[PDB]
Amino acid sequence: RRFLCGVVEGFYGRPWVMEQRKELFRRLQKWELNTYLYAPKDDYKHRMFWREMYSVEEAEQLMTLISAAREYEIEFIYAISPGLDITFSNPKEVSTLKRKLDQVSQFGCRSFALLFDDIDHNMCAADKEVFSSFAHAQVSITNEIYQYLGEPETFLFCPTEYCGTFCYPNVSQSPYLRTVGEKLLPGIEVLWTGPKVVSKEIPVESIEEVSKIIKRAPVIWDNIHANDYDQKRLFLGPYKGRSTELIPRLKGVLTNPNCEFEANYVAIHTLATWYKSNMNYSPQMALKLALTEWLQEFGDPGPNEKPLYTAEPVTLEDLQLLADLFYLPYEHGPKGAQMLREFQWLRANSSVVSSEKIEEWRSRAAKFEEMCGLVMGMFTRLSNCANRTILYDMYSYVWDIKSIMSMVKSFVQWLGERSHSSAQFLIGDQEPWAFRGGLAGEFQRLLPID
Amino acid sequence: RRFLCGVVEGFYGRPWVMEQRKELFRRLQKWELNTYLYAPKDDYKHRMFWREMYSVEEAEQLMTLISAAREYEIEFIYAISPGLDITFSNPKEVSTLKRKLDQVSQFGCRSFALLFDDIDHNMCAADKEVFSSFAHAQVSITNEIYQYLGEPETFLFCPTEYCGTFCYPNVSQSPYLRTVGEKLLPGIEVLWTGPKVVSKEIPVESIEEVSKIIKRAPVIWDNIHANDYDQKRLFLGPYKGRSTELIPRLKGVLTNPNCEFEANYVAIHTLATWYKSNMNYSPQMALKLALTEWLQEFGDPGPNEKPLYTAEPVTLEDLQLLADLFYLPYEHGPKGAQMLREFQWLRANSSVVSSEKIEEWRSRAAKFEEMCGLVMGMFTRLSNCANRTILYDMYSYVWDIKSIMSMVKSFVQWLGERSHSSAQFLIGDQEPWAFRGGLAGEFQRLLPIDG
Numbered sequence: 001r002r003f004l005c006g007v008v009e010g011f012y013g014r015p016w017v018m019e020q021r022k023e024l025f026r027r028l029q030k031w032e033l034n035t036y037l038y039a040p041k042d043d044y045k046h047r048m049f050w051r052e053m054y055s056v057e058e059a060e061q062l063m064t065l066i067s068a069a070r071e072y073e074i075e076f077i078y079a080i081s082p083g084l085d086i087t088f089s090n091p092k093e094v095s096t097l098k099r100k101l102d103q104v105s106q107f108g109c110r111s112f113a114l115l116f117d118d119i120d121h122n123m124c125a126a127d128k129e130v131f132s133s134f135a136h137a138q139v140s141i142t143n144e145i146y147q148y149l150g151e152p153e154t155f156l157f158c159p160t161e162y163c164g165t166f167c168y169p170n171v172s173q174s175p176y177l178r179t180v181g182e183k184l185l186p187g188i189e190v191l192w193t194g195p196k197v198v199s200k201e202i203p204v205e206s207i208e209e210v211s212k213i214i215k216r217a218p219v220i221w222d223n224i225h226a227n228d229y230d231q232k233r234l235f236l237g238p239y240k241g242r243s244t245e246l247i248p249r250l251k252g253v254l255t256n257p258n259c260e261f262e263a264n265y266v267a268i269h270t271l272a273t274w275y276k277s278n279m280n281y282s283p284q285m286a287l288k289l290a291l292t293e294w295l296q297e298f299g300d301p302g303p304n305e306k307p308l309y310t311a312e313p314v315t316l317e318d319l320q321l322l323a324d325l326f327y328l329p330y331e332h333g334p335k336g337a338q339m340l341r342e343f344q345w346l347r348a349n350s351s352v353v354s355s356e357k358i359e360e361w362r363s364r365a366a367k368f369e370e371m372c373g374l375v376m377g378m379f380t381r382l383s384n385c386a387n388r389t390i391l392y393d394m395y396s397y398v399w400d401i402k403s404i405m406s407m408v409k410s411f412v413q414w415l416g417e418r419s420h421s422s423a424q425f426l427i428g429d430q431e432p433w434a435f436r437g438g439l440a441g442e443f444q445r446l447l448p449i450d
Numbered sequence: 451r452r453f454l455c456g457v458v459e460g461f462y463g464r465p466w467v468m469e470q471r472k473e474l475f476r477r478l479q480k481w482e483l484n485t486y487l488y489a490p491k492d493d494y495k496h497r498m499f500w501r502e503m504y505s506v507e508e509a510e511q512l513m514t515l516i517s518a519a520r521e522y523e524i525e526f527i528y529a530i531s532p533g534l535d536i537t538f539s540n541p542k543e544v545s546t547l548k549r550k551l552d553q554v555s556q557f558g559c560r561s562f563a564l565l566f567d568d569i570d571h572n573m574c575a576a577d578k579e580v581f582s583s584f585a586h587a588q589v590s591i592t593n594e595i596y597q598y599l600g601e602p603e604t605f606l607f608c609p610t611e612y613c614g615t616f617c618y619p620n621v622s623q624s625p626y627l628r629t630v631g632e633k634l635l636p637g638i639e640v641l642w643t644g645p646k647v648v649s650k651e652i653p654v655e656s657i658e659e660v661s662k663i664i665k666r667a668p669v670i671w672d673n674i675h676a677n678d679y680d681q682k683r684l685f686l687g688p689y690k691g692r693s694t695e696l697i698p699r700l701k702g703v704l705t706n707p708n709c710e711f712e713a714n715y716v717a718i719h720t721l722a723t724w725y726k727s728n729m730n731y732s733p734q735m736a737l738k739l740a741l742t743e744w745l746q747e748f749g750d751p752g753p754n755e756k757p758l759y760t761a762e763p764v765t766l767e768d769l770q771l772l773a774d775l776f777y778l779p780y781e782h783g784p785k786g787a788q789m790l791r792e793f794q795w796l797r798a799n800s801s802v803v804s805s806e807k808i809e810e811w812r813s814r815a816a817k818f819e820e821m822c823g824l825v826m827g828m829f830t831r832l833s834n835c836a837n838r839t840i841l842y843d844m845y846s847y848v849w850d851i852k853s854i855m856s857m858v859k860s861f862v863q864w865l866g867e868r869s870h871s872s873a874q875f876l877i878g879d880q881e882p883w884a885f886r887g888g889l890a891g892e893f894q895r896l897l898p899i900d901g
């Protein structure tokens with residue numbers, strides 16, 4: 001029983017580089033995962049200019065990339081997205097699509113995908129005269145490509161209605177999916193993101209629902225750890241909301257993770273744990289394993305001689321804290337959720353300190369300040385660690401939380417000194433606001449803060 | 451007369467990748483520049499763990515990188531920074547340094563550099579017993595490496611006192627530089643950043659000053675476009691503050707630019723213009739050329755057939771505006787300087803609208819709101835162009851300017867409404883503050899903005 005488990009590079013944003021992808025293939029193999037779907041939205045020749053051939057430089061890179069996948073026994077799948085401006089009814093458009101995939105096939109690629117995600121449902125007049133519907137047009141060209149490429153063992157199709165919320169009028173009664181299930185050649189796989197684009201949970205019943213109308217078990221394109229929809233978000237939490245009971249009901253799972261390559265250790269490690277779990281998986285136990293394994297990636301003179309360069313090393317606790325601060329799309333981690341609650345409470349109840357309630361406030365304030373210090377401890381230790389590669393992939397996120405938290409600790413301390421002081425708390429007096437660089441900082445200082 | 455002109459990848463931050471460096475070599479050649487100094491502070495084996503050999507994977511990458519430099523006729527210079535924890539007096543430390551540079555030499559590298567920048571001046575007791583000073587220790591090992599590597603044609607030394615402000619007690623009377631000038635082998639080049647780490651201007655007289663004590667013309671390591679000292683600063687302005695009169699008084703210029711690769715088009719293009727200027731250079735003319743050339747990097751069906759994908763293209767004006775907002779360390783660009791002045795004025799004179807003065811306020815407010823709209827327009831055209839990745843390098847900056855700017859436009863609109871509406875202006879009510887994502891955003895919303 002073949003099962004596609006791995007990664008889809010299918011986000012908007014800076015595509016990953018050779019060095020990173022080769023590293024991804026090493027990791028997938030060691031974690032017994034087997035698939036890689038090549039689909040960067042911002043490779044201008046994958047989507048926007050799907051018609052254009054790859055240059056000689058681009059060709060050498062793709063050959064190298066495909067050889068690296070083969071070397072680590074990872075199935076490389078080349079995806080193409082022609083849906084933005086293709087005229088399905090034009091024979092010249094069909095041979096251009098064939099020309100493009102023959103080029104990539106000449107680079108050693110054996111598996112392919114046709115994606116029709118995030119495109120206008122409205123066809124041109126020429127296509128309307130040839131196909132009963134949009135689904136007819138897509139299936140027609142997808143079947144033609146699949147057969148033209150000699151019916152590859154691994155060939156995927158991504159529908160325009162790729163999740164529950166995108167199905168018109170719904171999953172069970174979609175005429176688009178109806179056509180897909182009936183006319184799409186049986187050997188072609190169908191990609192699905194679950195109930196939503198970013199699914200909190202993928203319930204077994206929803207997979208049975210879609211499998212009936214598409215007439216096959218789908219391959220999940222999972223957006224649980226994707227973050228290209230918010231420049232200020234990062235998901236270091238475990239694979240969650242997908243029962244192992246989905247495994248016999250699926251043809252595979254391809255995770256579409258965070259843009260920042262090094263942040264995808266937990267995302268991919270926990271998915272591998274889930275896949276090999278023997279129908280018994282715990283997100284908390286999986287997160288602990290991933291964090292423990294991740295920590296490894298973070299790592300002589302005389303008395304009158306110069307001491308060797310040394311830094312206070314990153315701890316498991318620092319990583320537990322970090323993952324809890326940058327957790328999942330629908331939940332913060334325990335430690336982050338707790339800190340937020342503590343801050344909300346202290347701010348809401350600051351009036352008691354402006355008897356047992358005063359004791360409660362001071363006790364919770366002291367515990368919060370320690371929590372704040374631990375975030376600073378984490379920042380400092382990460383910023384002085386051996387692995388600069390891991391650090392600079394997340395630095396902005398960590399720096400940002402560290403900065404906001406020091407203003408929060410200051411404010412909580414100010415609220416405490418209120419009984420002994422009439423001094424005012426000003427955001428303008430805080431270093432992140434006052435010492436903010438660039439032209440933007442000059443403008444920001446002139447805004448009416450306080 | 452050999453003259454080293456090019457780039458030094460010598461900052462703190464994420465090092466550039468293979469794809470980027472190969473592109474840098476293509477650009478340097480086409481712009482008739484010739485040198486690349488490899489010195490990323492955060493390549494863990496360049497500085498922090500200078501002793502450790504490169505792995506097999508690291509080795510293949512360095513070989514590929516060095517072959518790419520040769521392919522585009524760029525001199526590749528490998529730098530090593532052992533100064534944080536080296537015991538100069540230890541023979542084992544000296545052979546480790548030799549072992550490390552023999553490894554990189556085996557990858558095809560012919561040129562080398564020893565850097566002693568940003569290190570504690572205080573030597574260990576073992577070193578004090580062997581060398582009269584810190585300068586003695588450095589020169590000793592630098593001369594040993596240079597000769598051990600068979601005296602390479604291109605060999606550089608970066609002093610601990612690499613700029614005017616870092617010289618104790620001053621440039622002309624530095625005992626450290628005195629030792630450097632006297633004992634450093636003549637064939638070795640000395641790197642210098644001018645009067646400061648980030649020099650506003652490099653005056654000819656300052657180069658004469660330093661050349662006397664170091665007893666040679668230096669190679670400028672220029673930090674004009676560097677941005678690792680501030681997470682919120684970016685420099686797209688032209689090469690400025692360095693007369694072409696410096697060229698015959700220097701062994702070269704190596705620019706240390708912004709951490710974000712695609713943001714170094716102007717920085718490197720204008721330096722090439724300056725280098726080939728034939729003693730007549732204009733920063734404004736150079737900036738215009740660079741911007742015009744950079745615009746190129748941003749770029750049939752029937753009537754009943756589907757129209758080809760098309761995007762509203764990025765304009766020269768958008769680039770002029772972008773460069774003006776992220777200009778130079780000591781100056782904003784005209785358009786950015788103007789916008790700031792307009793905002794300062796409007797805020798300072800808001801009381802008139804709380805007769806000809808009211809007309810002035812309303813007129814300047816309207817012009818400012820258009821200026822604000824042009825910034826959003828620029829942001830939008832850049833995020834929807836053919837080459838999205840250029841903006842992916844600069845996103846944090848463009849997003850931040852766009853965001854503050856929208857809040858500033860709101861504030862200016864609120865100020866002009868104070869005569870009619872009684873509504874209060876709240877930062878918390880503004881979209882960049884209110885719709886801020888992540889856990890950090892949740893905490894930020896709970897901060898006492900507006901008291």
Ligand SMILES: CC(=O)Nc1nc(F)c(CN2CC[C@H](OCc3noc(C)n3)C[C@@H]2C)s1
Pocket residue numbers: 010011012041117118158162191193197198221223226228229256
């Ligand atoms: C088949 C399939 O899943 N195709 C995809 N293509 C890309 F580029 C994806 C990544 N990003 C793109 C931006 C999307 O922002 C809109 C959004 N939808 O909900 C939320 C939350 N944001 C989120 C989405 C997760 S997922």
Ligand SMILES: CC(=O)Nc1nc(F)c(CN2CC[C@H](OCc3noc(C)n3)C[C@@H]2C)s1
Pocket residue numbers: 460461462491567568608612641643647648671673676677678679706
């Ligand atoms: C010989 C020579 O010039 N060597 C250099 N090494 C690095 F890494 C440079 C780049 N950066 C390093 C950081 C410097 O920040 C100092 C600073 N000032 O306030 C704060 C905060 N940091 C500025 C300087 C421009 S220049």
